[PDB]
């Protein structure tokens, strides 16, 4: 017999922030981004 | 965890002009590598 078991997590979180302001007039721009990639993997093989 | 966060400011006067900006880009990552492997055998022979 044998009992293979595998449990894999990959988590990624990536964030972007860009606030800007210009004046002489006034102008401003804010941008924000959040990204996530996730994978969960489970694999098993049992043989007798 | 990785961070790049920066704040810039500028005023200039002659009339006046100003600019101010803030950026903060960031990453976080995690991996978990859990695993197991059990194996075995039995012979038996009798006479």
């Amino acid at each position: 017999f044998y009992n293979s078991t595998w449990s894999y997590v990959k988590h990624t979180s990536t964030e972007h922030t860009s606030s800007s302001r210009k004046r002489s007039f006034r102008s401003s721009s804010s941008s924000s981004r959040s990204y996530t990639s996730h994978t969960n993997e489970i694999h098993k093989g049992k043989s007798y | 965890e990785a961070k790049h966060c920066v704040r810039i400011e500028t005023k200039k006067r002659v009339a006046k002009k100003t600019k101010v900006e803030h950026r903060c880009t960031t990453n976080k990552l995690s991996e978990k590598h859990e695993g197991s492997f059990i194996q075995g055998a039995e012979k038996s022979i009798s006479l």
Binding site: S4, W6, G45 | H33, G35, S36, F37
Partner: peptide, 29 residues
């Protein structure tokens, strides 16, 4: 290490027909 992640090659053909040859295999490292 979960060595099954680096799966085995199949057994090399038996080294000789008789009188105990050997067969062997590397992993896909």
């Amino acid at each position: 290490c979960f060595c099954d992640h680096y799966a085995w090659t199949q057994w090399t053909s038996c080294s000789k027909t008789c009188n105990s040859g050997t067969q062997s295999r590397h992993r896909q490292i």
